[PDB]
Amino acid sequence: MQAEILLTLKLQQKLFADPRRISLLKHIALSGSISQGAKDAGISYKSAWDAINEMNQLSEHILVERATGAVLTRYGQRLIQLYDLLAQIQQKAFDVLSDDDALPLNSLLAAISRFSLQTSARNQWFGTITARDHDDVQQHVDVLLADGKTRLKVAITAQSGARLGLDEGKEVLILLKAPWVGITQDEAVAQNADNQLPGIISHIERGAEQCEVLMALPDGQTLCATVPVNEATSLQQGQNVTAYFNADSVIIATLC
Amino acid sequence: MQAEILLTLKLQQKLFADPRRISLLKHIALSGSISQGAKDAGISYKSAWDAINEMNQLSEHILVERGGAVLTRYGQRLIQLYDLLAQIQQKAFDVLSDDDALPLNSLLAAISRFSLQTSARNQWFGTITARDHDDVQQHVDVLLADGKTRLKVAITAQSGARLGLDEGKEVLILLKAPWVGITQDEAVAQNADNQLPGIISHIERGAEQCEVLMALPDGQTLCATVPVNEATSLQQGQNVTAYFNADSVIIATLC
Ligand code: MOO
Ligand code: MOO
Ligand SMILES: [Cl-]
């Protein structure tokens, strides 16, 4: 149903971790024998003793000493935890980024966001940092959406701006939680916010305390916003509205 | 240390992709022919071929075609997916390549470290303990990785289902600084869906904004961006209560 990937780990032009090799380090921890491990995994205490004296060496920490004066070392234990994990990634990055005509939309950042974690934000957009100040506490950056026609002002702490490398040209991902988006026909109300997105209500579902207003954007895309009732009562479908939100109500996401 | 990660990819229990088959396909794209495309990589012009149609054998497609040989849409893709995965795994290694800095052996905690990075100054790992069925906006309750403090979050119904946010599900809590206030009027604190008592450890004053750092009983640090407007009585080493609402937090889960 799938395919199997094998993680080979080379350390300074040579070999360090082979699937069969990690199998040895694990079988030597469950057997506790210099050989029984080499045995419990298709090796002959040779490709095993040779792949170890050369594995302890290449490694910055002995992975298996003797017994008391075949036993491992904490670092040998972390190597197993590390590899196995590095093995899990593969499968998922592979399971995701899976294939074909069905899913695909952009590259690197756009593709990593596909297997990486996912957020509850109903509005996620890709853009590019076109500017940024240098306020000692809170800074503001300008983002030009992948549509090259939409501008947005976002605010983040300086420590954050510095670590994500939000410099000019940086490709980002705008995470806007539906509740941070307002809908209005009152161009005045929309114009008081830092961000405005014109559009028409393509759908409106009214709950008991909240309402999910879906807005069709000139893009074709849909902006989602959760508006209370005492604010989303006059709103109707097919109406020309304007989504608005302030710069401090947005999260940024970069690979850095 | 100073390590490279060569990636061996196999399907149907057979060598499908290999760094060499890739350099084979990449040079076929550079030279345009299998002929040169072979030497410019690693001999056997007279082998590469059964190796290219063996992959055309393993995928049912025809990775590479044929004056000379031109890659396919599936050939360049498979080339981009390998190289892509080649980076991902390289990073994953390097970011994680530590001596004692574990992501709680959680794919989540681990993935979060090398994959997309967010600007939220407050990110805590937790586990969903509950969730309602309200049609429009639901509410999930979280129990952080300290098994004590419970948070309450609000998400759209589609987000609740699309992520599988049910009991036991592991999540990462994203809380941007500006959505967190810090008071002492228990009336303000108790009024917010969320409240976390602490003690101010530092206060960065600015022309209009302040950056208050409160140390959580955890021993960590919560960060809030407070308008000097709402930071007139805030001082250092003071027992305060940080507060935020349920609809001001984003959840990040796996798949
Ligand atoms: O599901 Mo959200 O986090 O309200 O956009
Ligand atoms: O630095 Mo922020 O204000 O948590 O995105
Ligand atoms: Cl509701």
Tell me: do A226 and A156 sit in the same domain: no
Residue in A with minimal Cα distance to B245? A179
Q: How many helices (H) and strands (E) does chain A have?
A: 7, 12
Residue B41 · residue B52 · CB < 8 Å: no
**CATH code where residue B2 lies:** 1.10.10.10
Tell me: do B7 and B94 sit in the same domain: yes
Measure Cα distances from A21 to A6, A72, A90 in Å: 11, 14, 18
- CA A103 remoteness from chain centre: 17
Query: Considering CB atoms only, which of B2, B108, B255 is closest to A12?
Result: B2
Task: Kindly state the tokens that stand for B129.
Answer: 């303990």
Query: Considering CB atoms only, which of A59, A117, A122 is closest to B112?
Result: A117
Q: Which residue has the tokens 């969903």?
A: B128
How many Cβ atoms sit within 10 Å of the Cβ of residue A208?
10
Give how many domains chain A has, as a whole number.
Answer: 3
Task: Kindly state the tokens that stand for A235.
Answer: 């709103």
Interatomic CA distance for residues B166 and A238, integer angstroms:
35
Tell me: do B10 and B123 sit in the same domain: no
DSSP code of residue B17 = E
In sequence order, what are the residues at sequence separation of 6 or more whose Cβ sits closer than 8 angstroms to the Cβ of residue B107?
A: A85, A88, A89, A92, B254
**CATH code where residue B159 lies:** 2.40.50.100
A-chain CB neighbours of B4 within 8 Å are 10
Final residue before a domain boundary, out of A104, A127, A148:
A104
Task: Kindly state the tokens that stand for B253.
Answer: 């889960």
Question: Pocket around ligand 1: residues whose beta carbon is below 6 Å from it?
Answer: A 120-122, 177-179, 226; B 155-156, 159, 250
Ordered DSSP codes for B89-134: HHHHHHHH--SS---TT-HHHHHHHHS-EE--SEEEEEEEEEE---
Method used to obtain the model: X-ray
Tell me: do A97 and A112 sit in the same domain: no
Measure Cα distances from B98 to B28, B103, B248 in Å: 39, 11, 34
Query: CA dihedral defined by A190, A196, A199, A202, rounded to 10 degrees?
Result: -80
Residue A127 · residue A143 · CB < 8 Å: yes
Which amino acid residue places its CA nearest to atom 4 of ligand 1?
A: B155
The ligand with the least distance to the CA atom of B133 is 3
Task: Kindly state the tokens that stand for B106.
Answer: 């959680």
Interatomic CA distance for residues A168 and A130, integer angstroms:
5
The ligand with the least distance to the CA atom of A250 is 2
Residue A243 · residue A181 · CB < 8 Å: yes
Tell me: do B181 and B234 sit in the same domain: yes
DSSP code of residue A196 = E
Query: Considering CB atoms only, which of B87, B108, B179 is closest to A117?
Result: B108
The ligand with the least distance to the CA atom of A179 is 1
Interatomic CA distance for residues A119 and B252, integer angstroms:
4
Tell me: do A138 and A184 sit in the same domain: no
Determine the structural domain holding residue B208 and report its residue range: 175-245
Ordered DSSP codes for B134-194: -SSEEEEEEEETTSS-EEEEEEEHHHHHHTT--TT-EEEEEE-GGG-EEES-HHHHHHSSE
Q: Which has the closest alpha carbon to A77: B113, B182, B102?
A: B102
Tell me: do A190 and A226 sit in the same domain: yes
- Cβ of B1 and A120 within 8 Å? no
Tell me the shortest Cα–Cα distance from B172 to chain A, in angstroms: 9
- Burial A105-117, CB ≥16 within 10 A → b, else e: eeeebebbbebbb
Final residue before a domain boundary, out of B71, B103, B135:
B103
Final residue before a domain boundary, out of A48, A80, A104:
A104
Tell me: do A13 and A92 sit in the same domain: yes
- Cβ of B88 and A89 within 8 Å? yes
* Residue A117 DSSP SS3: coil
- Chosen for mutation from A109, A159, A177 (greatest number of chain B CBs closer than 10 Å) is A177
Interatomic CA distance for residues A131 and B148, integer angstroms:
42
- CA A241 remoteness from chain centre: 32
Task: Kindly state the tokens that stand for A181.
Answer: 């988006």
Within chain A, residue ranges assigned H as helices are 19-31, 36-39, 50-58, 74-95, 108-115, 158-163, 187-190
Interatomic CA distance for residues A118 and A127, integer angstroms:
18
* Residue B227 DSSP SS3: strand
Tell me: do B180 and B114 sit in the same domain: no
Q: Which has the closest alpha carbon to A140: B229, B225, B252, B246?
A: B225
Annotated resolution, angstroms: 2.8
- Cβ of B4 and A16 within 8 Å? no
Q: Which residue has the tokens 């590899």?
A: A83
Q: A240 C-alpha to center of ligand 1: Å?
A: 23
How many Cβ atoms sit within 10 Å of the Cβ of residue B255?
12
- For residue B217, give the amino acid letter: P
In sequence order, what are the residues at sequence separation of 6 or more whose Cβ sits closer than 8 angstroms to the Cβ of residue B83?
A: B22
Query: CA dihedral defined by A248, A182, A253, B100, rounded to 10 degrees?
Result: 70
Q: Which has the closest alpha carbon to B128: B112, B111, B145?
A: B145
Q: Which has the closest alpha carbon to B176: A248, A134, A136?
A: A248
Task: Kindly state the tokens that stand for B73.
Answer: 């849409």
Measure Cα distances from B232 to A196, B203, B215, B228, B236 in Å: 32, 11, 20, 6, 12
Measure Cα distances from B221 to B199, B202, B215, B224 in Å: 10, 10, 4, 10
Residue B211 · residue B203 · CB < 8 Å: yes
Interatomic CA distance for residues A240 and B254, integer angstroms:
37
- Cβ of B10 and A16 within 8 Å? no
DSSP code of residue A64 = B
| Largest Cα span, chain B | 81
Tell me: do B21 and B39 sit in the same domain: yes
* Residue A76 DSSP SS3: helix
Tell me: do B126 and B83 sit in the same domain: no
- Cβ of A86 and B93 within 8 Å? yes
Query: CA dihedral defined by A60, A66, A68, A74, rounded to 10 degrees?
Result: 40
B-chain CB neighbours of A97 within 8 Å are 81, 84-85
Task: Kindly state the tokens that stand for B71.
Answer: 């890659």
B-chain CB neighbours of A90 within 8 Å are 85, 89
Measured CA angle at B194 (ends B255, B103), to 5 deg = 40
Tell me: do B69 and B185 sit in the same domain: no
Interatomic CA distance for residues B71 and B64, integer angstroms:
4
| Burial tier of A1 (Cβ tally within 10 Å: 0-12, 13-18, 19+) | exposed
Interatomic CA distance for residues A41 and B52, integer angstroms:
32
